[PDB]
Amino acid sequence: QSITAGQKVISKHKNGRFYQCEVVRLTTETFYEVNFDDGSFSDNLYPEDIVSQDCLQFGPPAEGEVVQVRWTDGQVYGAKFVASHPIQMYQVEFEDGSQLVVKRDDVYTLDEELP
């Protein structure tokens, strides 16, 4: 089942419960993968988290390129760029006006049983 924009669906609100919501847009989110200098691996960096070069302006680093990364703790780490992969996601709006950007697997059609 493809999900299309304008479709009523069911997904989890920010309060953690399933509600009907409406798909307002199909977006593409690009995630970066890097190997930190200590060998730990991240698969979901945003391009703007690369702080050794301007990837929002000039695209991803070359594969294997040395980079510095601003992590979710606000600190900067050395790493090496592994890959980038774009992911189709679904911007949904709930009855209260709140919105989320979610993965295909987190969206359910009205006809289907919920987990």
Nearest Cα neighbor of 20 from 103, 82, 111 is 111
**DSSP string covering 55-114:** HHHH-PPPTT-EEEEE-TTS-EEEEEEEEEEEEEEEEEEETTS-EEEE-GGG-B-TTSPP
Q: How far apart are CA 13 and CA 98, in angstroms?
A: 8
Dihedral angle sign, alpha carbons of residues 67, 84, 48, 56: positive
Q: State the architecture of 31-84 in CATH terms.
A: Roll (3.10)
Q: Does the domain made of 1-30+85-115 have the CATH classification 3.20.20.10?
A: no
Burial of 109 (0-12, 13-18, 19+ CB in 10 A): exposed
Locate 20 and state its tokens: 């009907």
Domains 1-30+85-115 and 31-84 agree in fold: no
Q: How far apart are CA 29 and CA 88, in angstroms?
A: 7
Locate 89 and state its tokens: 């996601």
- Sorted by where each begins, the domain ranges of the chain are 1-30+85-115, 31-84
